[model samples]
Target: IMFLANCNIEELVTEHIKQFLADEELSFSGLKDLILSKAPIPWIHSSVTATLLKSRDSDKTEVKKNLEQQSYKAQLAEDKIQKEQDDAEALKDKKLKEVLTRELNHIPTQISEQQTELRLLHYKLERLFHSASIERLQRSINEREIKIQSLFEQEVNNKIKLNEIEKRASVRSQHHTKRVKRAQARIGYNSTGEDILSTLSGKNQSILLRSIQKQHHALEKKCSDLIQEADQINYPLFLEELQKYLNKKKHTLSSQEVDALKSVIKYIKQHLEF
Candidate 1:
């Protein structure tokens, strides 16, 4: 019974050692070979395996610590680079804003000065335009005044000549009436007490014709003088006033008389350049 228990203990120790070697990924050589050849004890094998596993675990812990430290340093370096880049960008933005602000500050003054100059120029141009307009208006007024004065003088002279010719024509008409009355007296009177000058003798007829010819000659002379005076004056101005006078007396005149006056006016207008 003692011998069977000892063999069973030896088998359990060998199996435990083989399991330890397999867990540590070690081959049965070097330290393992030496232990098996010189000291094939179960407690010693267990102690060495435990010590090797502990040392390996310590080394793995150290390597993990080193990796974590390196990773922390890399993170710190990346943060520093980012901070520097951010600061540089901020500085660039600040400088750009300052330049824009400086340029913007001058714009208002420049714009105001330009606007003032334009206003002054506009005012000067307006004044010049106003002065020119006034001068032109004054010149037009002076010319119109001169023409009006000339027309007035012409009208006055025409009125004087027309009055003289009318007076002469009136005297000649009176003389013709006297001659006609004399002829009628020499003839006879009708049933209605009217003059019968048609029953006059040839001698009286000849006398009446001579008298009419003299009156016609005087009228022709007057008309010729009047035409000469109209030629010396502005015909258009004289015609304008004459038309007004004729229109004013149109209601009082007979149609035949108006027609005769129109004929005379037309003849004069045709003869003279308006």
Candidate 2:
């Protein structure tokens, strides 16, 4: 009892005392009783107070350090996020600038190309205008109209000459038909012994008839030779002679005379015997 009174155990009651005893699975009152029995009460009280204060200060320091570490990590994360944002913005700006720069650089070339195209278009337009102007001059009415009128007048004159030649050929063909009829009548009479030299003496008439037949044979041979000569004549020279005769009035053959010449040539070729 004296020891218990010296222990002053009631004074040892506290939250630190309870927590320390609870860790050991003991009650504060029970621990106090045991400790007082073995040691001085003031010393136990002083030891418990010192240990509790040191533990509380140690817990506070640990919490402060943990908070500081978390703050530093948060700052690092923020800095990383800010850097990423800055890099992305810079990349975007760089891409935009590159696009703008390419377009700006191309502008002069585009302008030059357009200018070249415009010049080519102008050159083409100028050439077309000059070509049109030259064509108009080449096709001028005064230069072309006279030739056209001359050709038309020549055509009209040729038609008139062709009509006159046709009429003359018809008249000459009729005359040739009448001559053929007369020759046929004379041939029939001669076959019947009615000689054309009947006015001479009998012996003279026979001689005259023989002579006339020989003359006719000679004339036929001559006609045949003339036909061959006409056939062999140079056609261009013949056409040139005809053109010259038509062009010069002093030497010109009229259409009837020209047609008569053609009929005589044709008749010799067709009827002249070798």
Candidate 3:
């Protein structure tokens, strides 16, 4: 019974070792040779087989420890590389932000200076236009002054001639009154000679003369004022004012009168280059 039990335990250990060796991919022929040389059949016991298997298990455990250490080292190295890469990218982003901030800080100052320059230019333009307007107004005033001086000279000369004509008419009126008085005396007409004289002299001669003189004076004044005004105005403006005045007359103008006015305006424009 002892022999059988020992044999069974030994066979079980041998089979367990064989199965483990096969699973580990060891060469079966090489293990057989090693077993034939190292183990003796009668001495091959369960304890010996167990000890050998335990020794192989220890060596495999050492190999597995070395492999796990290498894998852990590779993982740590990869993590370190990733951290370095992340740090480099973060630093690059920080630098880019700094550059962008600096550029942004300069933009508002440049814009403000540009806006100021534009405002200055606008002010200069306004002043230039204002000066131009003043100069134009002064030129118009100067032209008007020259025209007024010319009209004044012409009006003075015309007034002198008008005064001489009035004096002549007064002398003619006295002569006609004396002739009428002498004719009434020669006829021995004792009637109110004043009435006859007045009838012969033409009715209310002084009043009619005064009224005609007043009308002539008024027309002369209006024409003189219009001439001075026309001199100050452009030809186009002068024509417009003259047409407006003509229209205000009580009688409607005939086509001939209208055409005559137009012809005169055209001729004046052509000849005087107005």
Candidate 4:
């Protein structure tokens, strides 16, 4: 029908569709998308609706038309800028040509309108050249700006990659330091208990301890005899020498023998306590 072809169907469709949307059974809203998806067209078919929902994968560049609109606006903005530059150049050319024509038409009655005529001609040439020069300068400036923007983005990208590299090196550094610390700790543990395997063969047992105990028995016998002949001040010096000798003797015994000697000292101390 010509009626259908020659009509603004928007009002009619909305007027009717509004009722369908309001129907309790088919109650979907323009605000909440169902048939009316707020897109170029409504969801086309039953098959298409589920497919649309699935494909919305939520990186939904298509779903929020704002991105498309923003890009469209940006494109228009750039086109407008380019068009204005072209127009400005054209306008400059026309205006300068107008100035020349006007000057020619306004020629003075005499030949010695020389200074005025010569100045006008030279100014016309200079002005036109300036307009053309400015066009190229502006384009070159924009070119450099675009390149600078790209390089800045690339530099950020490089720094992001560098961050990952730095972390990897940091992890490796952590592992190496941990390994060194572990080895040093193991050596530390070994140092505290050295040369201690006398449980089985007994061949390398505490020979030094037996000899020191026999010496201690003889030394105790001399302590009372020596005390009668000793000066009070000389006791400090005697003990200092004794300590040095004792310290030197300590390293000659196995760790287990040293422990046994300490236990003997503990029992002696316990007897004093009792």
Candidate 5:
């Protein structure tokens, strides 16, 4: 009882008595009825009182004798009871046996009678330490569980941020990639139109014949233009100079006669390229 130095006396003591009543194989209702009478258990543990009054005296002696030995030291009290039983008796102490027996019997009643004493001593030992400490451990466990749950939520949020970073392509690298594509677009592929025209898939006779006829016509017109221009620029000058030179040497020719002489001249010119 001293070990439970901090016992909660009043309310706790009443409950212990209820447990004591259970061990006696009795009903607790009678006690509850009287206990609620407000002023108290002069109504006491009513069931306990009834159980004591109802039991046969001879039967109670043995039950209480066991109780007595348990309360004192088991080893010590057993021998004490045995020695007195033997030495006084081998059988001589009739009053001694009855006295020891009566003391055991009254011990329980005396405590019950106190209004508030004995039984509560064990109540102190049985309940006090465990009561306060059980809650302490429970609250401690809750604190750790709450901490773990908070960390789980934080980890979940952290993963979301990590996903965003991984999903986005950085602007600098994207710009570099885009510029590379633009530079590639500026390059030329194949600039050979001559080979393309020769190997064209659909140049049939109808198209080719019409195209060559027009081409020859254009070349003939080009030759006429070339001869006309050359006659104007060159033939006139050549004839005039020749007529002047002849007249100086021995045969003189008039200007009008020289101009008329050009009408009889005929020139043929051939050219391989423009």
Candidate 6:
């Protein structure tokens, strides 16, 4: 029974070693040379087990070191990326705040200019009401009309120039975006897809047309009031002459005329406000 057991053990060990060497396609002489030279340990155990165990320990240490170093490098790279992103966001927010602030500061100037225009219009209305005859009124009105027209044109041109200047300035001044935004907000404006601050206020075209109609109605009421006052003062001849002059002047405001006036007014108001 001892002899039979010895035979079985020998067969099993020999077959297992042979199969492992065959699968790896390595030579016993090569492994012996490796251990004798650069290998850290000697192969006192069977060649196959010694080679596999030695390689496993060396591979484990190398893999562990490489993984730890790589993890550290990845963490450093992640931190650097996060810092750069934070810096960019902070700069963007700062620029926007500046733009809004600038815009808000300019609002008061715009309001004052608009008020002046309305006052000038009121003065012209008073002058028209007090003219001696329609003939005398016509010449004065024509002169005043030309002056007003010139002022309106100048104001519009100035606004366009200012807009161009602002655009150029914005490129140079990154921090002023906050001011621009603030001004827009106060004016009930928003940047359109085209990035233009259109001054038309999104008032429906119909509403704009109605405004012209209202102005016409107001002018007619004032003229009627003047005629009633003239009648009460026994100035029928003056009233008749004024009516004839008005008919000749054809001074009723049309939608197109009102639009032109508003356009000039808006342009002037935009740049001349503050």
Model 6, 1-274: lDDT tens digits are 1121122323333443334333333333443343223222122124433333344345444443444334434433644564566557557656754665555456456556655665665576666553445466456556655665665665565556556556655553553443344345435423332212222223332444454455445544543443333223322222222224323433444445435544543443455542
Lowest lDDT 10-residue stretch of candidate 5: 192-201
Q: 2 or 3: which has the higher TM-score?
A: 3
Residue pairs of candidate 2 with colliding backbone atoms: none
lDDT of 5 by residue, 133-156 (tens): 656545554554565455455555
- Which order, best to worst by lDDT? 1, 3, 2, 6, 4, 5
Question: CA lDDT, every prediction?
Answer: 0.46, 0.44, 0.45, 0.39, 0.38, 0.42
lDDT of 3 by residue, 1-274 (tens): 1121123333344443333333333333432343333223222233344444454445444444444334434433644565566556556655655655565566556556645655555555456554566676555555545554554565555556556555655555565555555455425423532222222224334543454455445544543443343233322332444454445543345556656665655565566443
Stretches of model 1 off by over 4 angstroms after superposition: 1-53, 128-274
lDDT of 5: 0.38
lDDT computed for candidate 2: 0.44
- Higher-ranked by TM-score: 1 or 2: 1
Clashing pairs in 5: 41-44, 86-90, 88-92, 89-92
- Give the range where candidate 4 is weakest over 10 consecutive residues by summed lDDT: 195-204
Rate residue 32 of model 6 by lDDT. 31
Write candidate 2's Cα lDDT for 5-100 as tens digits.
132223333332333333423233442243223222343345544543444345444443444334434433644565566556556655655655
Against the true structure, what is each candidate's TM-score? Answer: 0.28, 0.26, 0.27, 0.20, 0.20, 0.26
Question: RMSD to native for every prediction?
Answer: 77.0, 80.3, 72.0, 46.7, 65.9, 51.3
- Please rank every candidate by TM-score, starting with the best: 1, 3, 6, 2, 4, 5
